Paper text:
The two membrane glycoproteins on the surface of influenza A virus, hemagglutinin (HA), which functions as the receptor binding and membrane fusion glycoprotein in cell entry, and neuraminidase (NA), which functions as the receptor destroying enzyme in virus release, form the basis for defining subtypes. Hemagglutinin binds to sialic acid (SA) glycans present on host cell surfaces. Here we report a detailed molecular analysis of the RBS of the HA from North American lineage H7N2 virus, NY107, including glycan microarray analyses and structural analyses of the HA in complex with an avian receptor analog (3′-Sialyl-N-acetyllactosamine, 3′SLN) and two human receptor analogs (6′-Sialyl-N-acetyllactosamine, 6′SLN; Sialyllacto-N-tetraose b, LSTb). The overall structure of NY107 is similar to other reported HA structures with a globular head containing the RBS and vestigial esterase domain, and a membrane proximal domain with its distinctive, central helical stalk and HA1/HA2 cleavage site.
In the NY107/6′SLN complex, only Sia-1 and Gal-2 are ordered. The Sia-1 remains in the same position as previously analyzed glycan/HA complexes from H1, H2, H3, H5, and H9, whereas the Av-H7 complex structure with Sialyllacto-N-tetraose c (LSTc) did not reveal any density for the Sia-1 in the receptor binding site. The Gal-2 position varies significantly among different subtypes. Compared to the human-adapted H1 HA, Gal-2 in the NY107 HA is 3Å higher, and thus is further from the protein. In NY107, the Gal-2 only forms an intramolecular, saccharide-saccharide interaction with Sia-1. The poor electron density map and fewer interactions with protein residues suggest that the cis conformation of α2-6 linkages in 6′SLN trisaccharides show a reduced binding affinity with NY107.
Author numbering:
A (entry chain A), B (entry chain C), C (entry chain E): 10 to 142, 144 to 158, 158A, 158B, 159 to 220, 229 to 261, 263 to 276, 276A, ...
D (entry chain F): 1 to 171
E (entry chain D): 1 to 172
F (entry chain B): 1 to 175
Write the structure that this text describes.
Amino acid sequence: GDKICLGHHAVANGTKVNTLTERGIEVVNATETVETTNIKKICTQGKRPTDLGQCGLLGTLIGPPQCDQFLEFSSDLIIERREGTDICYPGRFTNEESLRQILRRSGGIGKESMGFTYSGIRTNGATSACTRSGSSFYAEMKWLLSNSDNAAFPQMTKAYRNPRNKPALIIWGVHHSESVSEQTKLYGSGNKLITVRSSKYQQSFTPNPGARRIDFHWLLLDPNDTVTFTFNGAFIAPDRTSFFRGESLGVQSDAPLDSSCRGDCFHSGGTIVSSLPFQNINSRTVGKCPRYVKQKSLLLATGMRNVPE
Amino acid sequence: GDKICLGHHAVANGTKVNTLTERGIEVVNATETVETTNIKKICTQGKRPTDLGQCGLLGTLIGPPQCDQFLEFSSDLIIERREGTDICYPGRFTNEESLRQILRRSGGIGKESMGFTYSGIRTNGATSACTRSGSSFYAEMKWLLSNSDNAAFPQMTKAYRNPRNKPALIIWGVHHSESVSEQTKLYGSGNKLITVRSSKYQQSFTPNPGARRIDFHWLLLDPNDTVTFTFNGAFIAPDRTSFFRGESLGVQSDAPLDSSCRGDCFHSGGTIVSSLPFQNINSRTVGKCPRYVKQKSLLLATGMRNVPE
Amino acid sequence: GDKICLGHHAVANGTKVNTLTERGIEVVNATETVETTNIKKICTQGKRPTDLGQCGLLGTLIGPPQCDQFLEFSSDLIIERREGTDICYPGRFTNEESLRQILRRSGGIGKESMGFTYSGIRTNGATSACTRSGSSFYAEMKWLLSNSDNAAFPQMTKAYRNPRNKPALIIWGVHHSESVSEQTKLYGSGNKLITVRSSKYQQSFTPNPGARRIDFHWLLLDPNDTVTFTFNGAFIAPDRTSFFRGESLGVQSDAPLDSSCRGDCFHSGGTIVSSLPFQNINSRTVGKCPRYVKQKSLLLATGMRNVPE
Amino acid sequence: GLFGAIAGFIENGWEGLINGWYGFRHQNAQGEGTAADYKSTQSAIDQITGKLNRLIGKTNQQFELIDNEFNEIEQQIGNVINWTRDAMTEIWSYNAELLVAMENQHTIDLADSEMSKLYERVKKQLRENAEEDGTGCFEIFHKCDDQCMESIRNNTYDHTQYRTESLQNRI
Amino acid sequence: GLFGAIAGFIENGWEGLINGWYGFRHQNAQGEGTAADYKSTQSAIDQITGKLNRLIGKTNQQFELIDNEFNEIEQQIGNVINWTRDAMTEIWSYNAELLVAMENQHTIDLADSEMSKLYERVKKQLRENAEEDGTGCFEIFHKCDDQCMESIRNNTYDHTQYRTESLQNRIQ
Amino acid sequence: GLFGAIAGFIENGWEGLINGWYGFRHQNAQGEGTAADYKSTQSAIDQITGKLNRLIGKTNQQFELIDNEFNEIEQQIGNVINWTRDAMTEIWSYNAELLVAMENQHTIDLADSEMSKLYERVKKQLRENAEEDGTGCFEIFHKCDDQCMESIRNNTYDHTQYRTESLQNRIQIDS
Ligand SMILES: CC(=O)N[C@H]1[C@H]([C@H](O)[C@H](O)CO)O[C@@](OC[C@H]2O[C@@H](O)[C@H](O)[C@@H](O)[C@H]2O)(C(=O)O)C[C@@H]1O
Ligand SMILES: CC(=O)N[C@H]1[C@H]([C@H](O)[C@H](O)CO)O[C@@](OC[C@H]2O[C@@H](O)[C@H](O)[C@@H](O)[C@H]2O)(C(=O)O)C[C@@H]1O
Ligand SMILES: CC(=O)N[C@H]1[C@H]([C@H](O)[C@H](O)CO)O[C@@](OC[C@H]2O[C@@H](O)[C@H](O)[C@@H](O)[C@H]2O)(C(=O)O)C[C@@H]1O
Ligand SMILES: *[C@@H]1O[C@H](CO)[C@@H](O[C@@H]2O[C@H](CO)[C@@H](O)[C@H](O)[C@H]2NC(C)=O)[C@H](O)[C@H]1NC(C)=O
Ligand SMILES: *[C@@H]1O[C@H](CO)[C@@H](O[C@@H]2O[C@H](CO)[C@@H](O)[C@H](O)[C@H]2NC(C)=O)[C@H](O)[C@H]1NC(C)=O
Ligand SMILES: *[C@@H]1O[C@H](CO)[C@@H](O[C@@H]2O[C@H](CO)[C@@H](O)[C@H](O)[C@H]2NC(C)=O)[C@H](O)[C@H]1NC(C)=O
Ligand SMILES: *[C@@H]1O[C@H](CO)[C@@H](O[C@@H]2O[C@H](CO)[C@@H](O)[C@H](O)[C@H]2NC(C)=O)[C@H](O)[C@H]1NC(C)=O
Ligand SMILES: *[C@@H]1O[C@H](CO)[C@@H](O)[C@H](O)[C@H]1NC(C)=O
Ligand SMILES: *[C@@H]1O[C@H](CO)[C@@H](O)[C@H](O)[C@H]1NC(C)=O
């Protein structure tokens, strides 16, 4: 009595996966779809990185001493550190976050002169917080005041037409003095006003004296369009203006760069390298990343139902 | 030997589709699920359309010459245009997009007279910037100023209580004159304070001369509630108030209206008409639209495997 | 000939369900997957609630008469009410919603004194807008004012270092007088200036006389960090600051509280108690909730296809 | 539908079959007789519970308030919240529909499968002693008394003991 | 196919079956001919029609404008919108890729089961009167004319009539 | 276990079939022997590689930072962002859960199918020359040496060649 049989393979102990109707059912082979192994470095290989070190991202636009070496740069991968600072002298940017969001995808920046020549005022206003080898204030800015103490500052109009291919990033500052008296000493008595106008933008600023500070503001000037500054004091004038290069990623991290691993997905704690559809590492990422899931492990059957002998 | 054989049909020209295991497998017949056919027309049949043209949406509230047509407009589909503007005399509405969004669903507006009367001042303040066969003003507003140059402005109080069953849109304005002398010439000398108070809103305003503007401010006033105004110059008064008619959809487009096609899903580049559950036409749609996808095509099989001999 | 036949159970009581192929096929047994059964109560069992009633949330910081028993509270379920009010005297908070959101997850507040002692000035400025036994003020606040009518208010500094392990919520106020005349009565005459300066926060304030109001402003002061108050009048200073307890969940509702039902999903009109994956009760919920769908019913088969005898 | 047994080659169910899901109905010299089967009935509910254990009693995420009901927030932000929220509703209403519709199809086809699987266990066990109707009955070509019927029911039926007898009846 | 009929034991399809989806091709002393089973074609078409019924003519919910392409909005909110929008597109593109891929799988296998079912019936209908060849044919063992082949398609084949006769042929 | 072969009528798998996925095991006069099946192993593997292509190495979506983790952004917009992110997480954790659980349901049943298909292939090959024992084996009713066993495995077995002997072994009665 001859016979032939039909059957399938099995291993001693397979791996447990979940199906629609059963939990932890053993199969011959399965593979992981959720990446949990993190590379604790910023993988810069192939990219041209910019570790901003002690320079805050926004510093690059106004130019405090910590950013002297980043006033112009080119990068497809910008790495912000926690110890970076945008300022040298009290004050915040308005919209600081969207400006970061814009700079993080700029591909770097390049400065160009606006060519403002000033008549009948003092240009060389300085602070000891900003003083350095180069100049005694923000590198890209000019602190404008009266020819003498308490002297009247003239009503003034300055305009800049963007002569370029792409939109310009225009930064100006408003000076809030330590006191009314101090505001008088730099710009003279009288109520002061700053108005900035392009064909998109229209905004009025009054100094609010009381606690020494310089608050900065910004807009995006259309190519061929003109901006207009009218001011009778407390005005921090741009000397240069930035132009964005190409396309970059912006990472906030405390991990060191490593120029010998290819990275596409980044987060506060390094790099995720994975052709896996999902990741459990970090929910806040930047680049081409696996989707963040809250599960540690999702095993996907690469084999059949394991039935031991 | 007599035989009976069973078997399926096939065609010479099958279609390619994708499954979970196969990609590019061939089926007898398939059906597209992603819409790619666009009508370059805003399909208004059935609707009561409004083509605002030269007139900006917020403009319909104050009444510059461009919006004389639509001071009390009535539609269920509001089409904005790029050339449309909200004002003639320089100045900007505050929290403007919030107001825009409210007006887009409003069903149109019905203007109702607030019943304000003034003596001791002039209410006929017109300007060349807004011409309507000679100098005029916003048709729903009154420019309040002194009887003669440099005459003092009386401390006034005006109250309006909402007699309707639905909220009332209250617009007023703060005129900022050109010079300090300009402001004294049209109103009093000294600090000009405007105070607007309802049972859920309190706000005050100070004019900022130096660059002329009328900046408009609004509040939604509930039925049987009062708005009180207390001012002494620089104030631009409402003549009429607005009430929303019902429901509407707001579209932004450069596409012409067509009253012969019908549709319900709109975007900047026309109308999407489709039973299909997905679309690759435009991601930024308004109305009742098919879900937007990235794929040009996704064919759904409507027939078995094509196995030709 | 003898025979054995095979079959399956059946019923008359069969439920119609939906499959990929047919809408309304009949199965032996089904089971609803969408929850529609609402409890008209806030379920507070196993938790520790705090119904705020007439007391508006932010009222717990400054202490108007409505909020007297809620000055320090311990809670993991904070319930706001439609009737709750934040103020007694006309005035508003800055970034009120932001503050509300951080208060709702605080775990409740604990209050501590700031060690503020004043001399050369009055401390007891009351108003009829807040009544305890007649004229009163905000319980966690001091209205500082000149020693008599028109007396000059002294120039002052007030410092407070956070002694604790967690951050502190410092609230101060600015008083805006009915008129310049009134401001000259309360404090001195002349420019009035307030500066609040922590290591991460600078902001000058000047009072604006015109309509009676008190505006409240705020910061989070870090451990070991000092906040500094320099002022010459119009200053509603804190007597006590506030520290957060742990973790709580904020709710808005009108439903009454019930300590005999358990639940983690709360909304506008009660609580959702369910192990079902979906709910059709309210699109806006808080806590640990099933997902809102728009279907009334999505029936899952729990038996075979039904073919009755 | 997929397997062709339930609402396929088998006419209908039995409203009288209360003892279980799937079962046998024998006819012979000693009257009728219906009796359920365990393994295949049990197996099917083991699966249906599995589906339920994956849906019922999930741990949901916590979500704080982002709106304010009593003090209307800035319409710009609210309308963004309202968009997102409604967009989320669309994604879930879809999932719910498609999950329930998808799981249901699988339930229908799995239950038809347990019928077939059992039907084939029997077909094999009888070898050449019985043929097939095509209506789900096996015409047995020998005398199988009520105590023989039960051997078939729980896999102890020895076909060799009835083979010689059966074969001549098929001629 | 999960059932192993279409692109399985059945070599190929028939480029001349216009009548329907599945058919009967008989060979006898009378000559060759081809028919088509209505019941199994119709059973398969409704399951495809039902698939399109759930996906076509879906009522969608209304959505209003949240941004502004003429006068651009505050870039904080703006970017949040864009960021959300981008994720929404990714979810739907994923779901559309999956719905179709998943539905097409079930469609192919559903049509295959239909083939399998029809074969199964004829097998059981023919009883001990015919033997399956393994490529989808049944060798009928009794002489069976055009009227006779009819009774199989028409599903009214009295097997008893031809048993003794076709059995004798099965031994010889 | 839809197709009832694996974890159904086939009692168990063979721990010593490392030559492939689905196999044969003969028992003839010349002893015992195992060989594997290329046609049906490959059919399954290709349909499993297909699934991996679909999920592994798919092009990821572009991601950008909307939060700020160094200097915290305004509270209100921070909560809206946080809320939105957590909805995504819920959505994607749902999808992944289900994607995998479904692909795993299809993998197991697709595998079962190929076993059942091969079994039905062999069943039809042998025709009247063998019987099914209910455990996945065929009781062959004629002498089948190593070459004969080989012909079955590689689908060249000619049933007409052995029919006459087999029938003399199956019908053990007079006609
Ligand atoms: C005049 C000028 O352009 N810059 C001054 C600067 C400004 O007056 C000030 O920043 C305006 O807000 O003040 C600087 O000097 C040193 C001096 O300043 C007092 O105001 C301060 O109380 C002390 O720190 C004192 O040392 C400065 O650098 O900040 C000098 C600079 O020339
Ligand atoms: C008085 C009035 O209602 N409208 C005036 C308008 C306003 O007074 C002004 O916009 C408010 O700031 O000014 C008009 O002005 C003539 C003249 O005014 C000088 O001050 C200015 O320096 C000149 O350039 C010139 O414009 C105007 O230009 O429209 C007249 C209008 O009736
Ligand atoms: C003096 C003081 O600290 N509080 C006053 C209070 C405030 O001065 C005022 O609210 C700030 O704008 O005014 C209070 O009084 C009653 C009385 O006040 C007159 O000024 C007003 O003209 C009258 O109509 C009447 O309301 C108050 O109760 O709020 C008295 C309080 O002592
Ligand atoms: C194959 O499928 C196509 C489309 O999926 C069918 O084309 C439709 O045919 C009808 C006429 O019967 C037309 O009115 C429609 O406009 C077509 N639809 C589309 C979307 O183009 C076609 O009927 C199918 N072919 C066969 C032979 O059935
Ligand atoms: C966003 O949607 C909510 C719905 O939850 C709106 O709030 C409702 O407002 C309508 C009238 O517009 C009332 O019928 C309801 O009573 C309100 N419900 C709640 C829970 O508040 C809200 O108006 C919408 N927001 C914006 C900015 O349009
Ligand atoms: C968010 O995305 C939109 C659309 O991708 C951006 O608007 C486009 O970009 C520029 C303007 O910067 C125009 O040339 C295009 O025509 C715009 N398209 C549309 C459809 O509006 C928008 O700029 C982005 N927002 C931010 C803050 O970057
Ligand atoms: C949004 O969510 C995140 C948490 O995922 C918050 O960010 C962090 O929260 C942790 C709490 O353990 C703290 O260490 C910090 O406050 C935050 N650090 C980092 C690196 O993100 C964030 O605070 C939340 N936003 C709001 C407004 O609550
Ligand atoms: C099983 O799958 C894994 C992928 O995770 C692979 O490394 C392994 O070689 C595969 N095959 C076997 C037989 O283990
Ligand atoms: C069948 O469904 C009903 C209603 O959902 C339920 O009461 C019952 O528990 C289920 N099971 C049985 C065996 O009836």
